[PDB]
Amino acid sequence: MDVIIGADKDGFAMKEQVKKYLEEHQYRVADVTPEPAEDFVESSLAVTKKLLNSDAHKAIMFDRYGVGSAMASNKVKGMVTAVVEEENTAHMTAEHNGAKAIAIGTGITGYDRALVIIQRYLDTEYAGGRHQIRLDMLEKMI
Amino acid sequence: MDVIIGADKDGFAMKEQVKKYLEEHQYRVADVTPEPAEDFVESSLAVTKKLLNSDAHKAIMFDRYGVGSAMASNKVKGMVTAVVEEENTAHMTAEHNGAKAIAIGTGITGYDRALVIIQRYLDTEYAGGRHQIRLDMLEKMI
Amino acid sequence: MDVIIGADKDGFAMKEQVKKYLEEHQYRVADVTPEPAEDFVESSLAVTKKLLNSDAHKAIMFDRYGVGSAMASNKVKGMVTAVVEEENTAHMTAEHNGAKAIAIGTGITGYDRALVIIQRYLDTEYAGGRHQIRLDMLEKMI
Amino acid sequence: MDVIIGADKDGFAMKEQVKKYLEEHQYRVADVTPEPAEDFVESSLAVTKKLLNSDAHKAIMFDRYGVGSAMASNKVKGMVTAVVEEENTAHMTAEHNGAKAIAIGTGITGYDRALVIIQRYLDTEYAGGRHQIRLDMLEKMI
Amino acid sequence: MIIAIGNDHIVTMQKIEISNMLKDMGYTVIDEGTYDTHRTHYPIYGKKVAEDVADGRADLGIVMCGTGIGISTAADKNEGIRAAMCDDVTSAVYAREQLNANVLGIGGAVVGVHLIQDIVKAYLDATYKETPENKKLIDKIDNIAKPNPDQKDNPHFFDAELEKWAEGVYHD
Amino acid sequence: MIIAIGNDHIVTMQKIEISNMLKDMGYTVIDEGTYDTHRTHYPIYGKKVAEDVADGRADLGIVMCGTGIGISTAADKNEGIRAAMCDDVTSAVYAREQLNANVLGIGGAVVGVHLIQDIVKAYLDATYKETPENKKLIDKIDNIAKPNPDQKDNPHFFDAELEKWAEGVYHD
Amino acid sequence: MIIAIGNDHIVTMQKIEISNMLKDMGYTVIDEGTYDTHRTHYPIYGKKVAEDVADGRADLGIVMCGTGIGISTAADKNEGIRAAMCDDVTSAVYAREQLNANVLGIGGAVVGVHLIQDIVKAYLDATYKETPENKKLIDKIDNIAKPNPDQKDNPHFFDAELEKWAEGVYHD
Amino acid sequence: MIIAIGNDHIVTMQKIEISNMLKDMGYTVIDEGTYDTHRTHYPIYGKKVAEDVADGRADLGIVMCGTGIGISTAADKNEGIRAAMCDDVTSAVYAREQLNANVLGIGGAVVGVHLIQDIVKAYLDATYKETPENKKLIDKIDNIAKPNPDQKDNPHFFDAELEKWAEGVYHD
Ligand SMILES: O=C(CO)[C@@H](O)[C@@H](O)[C@H](O)COP(=O)(O)O
Ligand SMILES: O=C(CO)[C@@H](O)[C@@H](O)[C@H](O)COP(=O)(O)O
Ligand SMILES: O=C(CO)[C@@H](O)[C@@H](O)[C@H](O)COP(=O)(O)O
Ligand SMILES: O=C(CO)[C@@H](O)[C@@H](O)[C@H](O)COP(=O)(O)O
């Protein structure tokens, strides 16, 4: 499986840690920010662009609070980004929302918890079915 | 106000940051672990001893998950330690439990969130009154 | 205390029994239907007129289902009639609604239960206070 | 379908009314109290005896409050009697409890409501299935 | 078919249960009653539901409060409405079949949910059957109240009372 | 005074409301009925409450299920018990004053909580008023069932049915 | 101040608790989210709340669903809105102070009510503190999406999907 | 497997949800915590659950209160218990795998039910894996407290405080 990742100056450290983690676990990673992005708008949009223009369906955005990356990337038509701070949303947003990416705030979530969140997200597939009506509604929006 | 702090190897880095934070905010800090403790049992017990023997009524323990420092320190008669990872418990445990210390897991809670949790804990006083029965019950236990 | 009573052909029998009951319990009763009214609209309106023009603040309407007497009398501006078939509403409608009258359906409610309902209604005074806003609103309607 | 009925002095009047009703609606009625029973213990036990010793699975007991007939008849091993005052229990007790008889209090329930209750009871069959465990438990009791 | 429903804060949970049921049954629901459980006033929602029915926005209405007396009385006090207060199936069926009642009132704190469901279902399943007898009763009922244009379709009708409430006039 | 209370899974929420009320009123409560809302069987809790009263561990008992019929009947089928199934205040007072009923049954899904509270309070406030007439009725009631030592105070009484349930014997 | 609130069926109970709190705090509330717990779709309510804020009918908005992701994302996908998905007090304050977020999203099934109350209060108490730095970030955020006149203030925007749903197009 | 569960009045509803889930999963449940929502004291139930586990009546325990701090601390203060306060899945798994925690504490008013379910499931699914490192940590923890025979298996341990409460000593 493939994973797209990116980060601004605040999330860079954790991004590097997760990158090594994912690579050591047979994951193919596409790092769109080898050097920290100017800010979370640039990093989140970079991850979004690479995702919507690739065959990967999972991505992780890193910044200080998570909120910013999701707020910005969700403005892009067709994008769905979930700020994740706990282990239930980690899988539920993938199952129900088919979240194309999750955003982790390094000033909010500790590293060990981040790894559990990430693994749950990566191990969960979109259920489709009745949930598609909601994804169709979102994609219709700006 | 006085505050007692301690940490093991995993919680040391955050402990050092918080110490700087407390000093900058006019807090008299007693650091029982200038060097990281062998493990969270040693650090949590050191904080407990210093606390139960000092005039301070606030303390912060640091380790990887928080769970351990609380599990160990709560075995001490009269001690009440709250693992805290969100902002409601941060004040409610002080108001209702008169928590003698809080335990923060560095692998669970990010720094910015830890600071808000800590400030809410330090800013809240034990309400006493009806809550005293529960504290009397806890104090009675081993 | 004063009580106004009325009934149509279906509620006449119970009305007569209650009248005897009220007299035996030192109640000054005003019977607006010595003979059964043509229908519940006539009986309920007769009770309403007598009530809104008398010093009494308690009244009981009798018919087959209760629903009709309440539906008709409530059309009168300022009137508040409660269909009652259980013992909680019997007092609550007086306490909160200051119900000017209650309506009992003889085909719905048995005599022994009707007596308990009636005594609870007569024994309860309107609480006023905050409830007055709702009564002012009702009084304002057609 | 067959129906077993009985009543004490207080429920006799309604029993006679229901008897005429049932007969006028193609129902075969077995009246075990052509003359009012001494009390509700005698009438309820008479209905129970005739029921458990017949091929009919529905019965109606009449008394002043309903409670007495059910309290007495339920003491008989294997008997299940439901006091009924409203239209939901009327059918639910048959569906779930397979109530062998319902008890109506003439001082509680008006005639028109009694007929609706009775019809719902008579028109409903025992669902069996998972509910049988509860009926097995009851039959095991004294 | 469209059903308008309303309630005060005491029975919002019961209203939700009935709303859910109505939708499962295929009815379109217009929820007017209060949406949370913050202290409010039953006449407000009774009037809202009554007008939905009277103006043709809804076919029938269902209103509930603790006992149902307050909100059903408020609903009844509107042009074109015949509100029946029914805590039992028997009178609810009578209300529809004989009085062609178009608004059903129920006491959500005195009637259990299973029975509330039965009352609602019975009321809706019932059909008005005109007869010379009930036609005359209905006509009388429809002509008791004197129409007030200032109340009809005026959502600000209770603003004066609401202001007095906000100013603490109605204290205990 | 001590009140034993029990219920099946359909009315656990109503039982909680009554338990709270009883404690606020100064009563000591022994909660036997089910504690959650997982599908279970009313006879189990009806028997537990009945025995608390019959054995002197509680002064009176209150039992509830959807309609109250099942659990009150189960309570009635025990030595020393006179269970009164009452969805109304009137018959509940009669049950206590005339039949000295020591277990009150109520349908938690058919009676609204405000009315349940009223029934309970009325039942508890009422006092048995002995007369040669009702004493004869009560004695007759107390002698209808034949005592079974295998049921009396036997906690494993329903083990047979519970096993069959765990083995899927009672499927739909 | 006016607060618009919305939700899907999974968290209607949590929405009610917050609505009650906001009113006790003196806020005027516009409840848009679903009113019962019948299965519905979060984008509907996210859009309604978003437009209330964007059009000036409400000062700020709060939206909730199971995780909050769906409804907050829907709210974010509207002109004039900056929706912040925050299951914690810390990021909610940051969202208001640095990003001047005007819509707060919370996961009502993953965050306990006491903490939800704390998040809401902290978000509302916080004030946007403009700096050349965050103004640049905000402006960039406000210019990412391309305005679509067909979505803006169009109540029939989702009619297409709703019909397909009524026609069983979205079965499992 | 047998799971003992307890709670104070603030989170009885959440306890019920977890009890239901545990039974659906095939676990046998011993409900000790409070059964209604009448104001009570968390140490009472924390101690009850702790002893069920310590005496072998239950394999593991789960305790909940508003924040979980009070009841989990009470549980921890008993011989043979290692109570872990975990409002998240990550530390709950750590608690079981590394500290062989036998009592799980959760804040029912700060954690949403869906996440509570995930924490419980993760905790139960996890397995203790002994290592020289955690074996030494566990041994230290097990030897911190000094055993008090007067507390062990004494259900009357808090009677003095309960009497003081009944006498109004603990007023606000
Ligand atoms: O039955 C009714 C009205 O018929 C009740 O719903 C109503 O009187 C409410 O109790 C009023 O609310 P509150 O002022 O908080 O007590
Ligand atoms: O009234 C009663 C019993 O008199 C009901 O409480 C009872 O029949 C329950 O409905 C049984 O539960 P379930 O098997 O999940 O349907
Ligand atoms: O978190 C969310 C959306 O972000 C949930 O609220 C949402 O996905 C609902 O679960 C959808 O409802 P249902 O179709 O009955 O499962
Ligand atoms: O989190 C906790 C304890 O850690 C709360 O459950 C507890 O403090 C209760 O609030 C006490 O109850 P009350 O006296 O009615 O406020």
Residue numbers in the entry:
A (entry chain C), B (entry chain A), C (entry chain A), D (entry chain C): 1 to 142
E (entry chain B), F (entry chain D), G (entry chain D), H (entry chain B): 1 to 172
From the article:
To obtain the LacAB-product complex, the crystals were soaked with tagatose-6-phosphate; X-ray data were collected at 1.65 Å resolution. The structure of the complex was resolved by molecular replacement with a refined substrate-free LacAB structure as the search model. The active site pocket was confirmed by the electron density of Tag6P in a wide-mouthed trapezoid-shaped cavity, 10 Å deep, between LacA and LacB. In contrast to the two substrate-binding sites of the RpiB homodimer, only one active site was verified in the LacAB monomer based on the Tag6P electron density map. The binding of Tag6P in the complex is stabilized by many hydrogen bonds with hydrophilic residues in the active site pocket. The phosphate group of Tag6P is bound by bidentate or tridentate hydrogen bonds to the guanidinium group of three arginine residues (Arg-130 and Arg-134 in LacA and Arg-39 in LacB) at average distances of 2.9, 2.8, and 3.0 Å, respectively. Additionally, the phosphate group of Tag6P, which is O6-linked to C6 of D-tagatose, forms a 3-Å polar interaction with the side chain of His-9 (LacB). The O3 hydroxyl group of Tag6P interacts with the carboxyl group of Asp-8 (LacB) and the main chain of Gly-66 (LacB), while the O4 hydroxyl group interacts with the imidazole group of His-96 (LacA). The terminal O1 hydroxyl group interacts with the side chain of Cys-65 (LacB) and the amide nitrogen of Gly-70 (LacB) at distances of 3.3 and 2.8 Å, respectively. The O2 carbonyl interacts with the amide nitrogen of Thr-67 (LacB) at 2.9 Å.
D-Galactose-6-phosphate isomerase from Lactobacillus rhamnosus (LacAB; EC 5.3.1.26), which is encoded by the tagatose-6-phosphate pathway gene cluster (lacABCD), catalyzes the isomerization of D-galactose-6-phosphate to D-tagatose-6-phosphate during lactose catabolism and is used to produce rare sugars as low-calorie natural sweeteners. The crystal structures of LacAB and its complex with D-tagatose-6-phosphate revealed that LacAB is a homotetramer of LacA and LacB subunits, with a structure similar to that of ribose-5-phosphate isomerase (Rpi). Structurally, LacAB belongs to the RpiB/LacAB superfamily, having a Rossmann-like αβα sandwich fold as has been identified in pentose phosphate isomerase and hexose phosphate isomerase. One active site is distinctly located at the interface between LacA and LacB, whereas two active sites are present in RpiB.
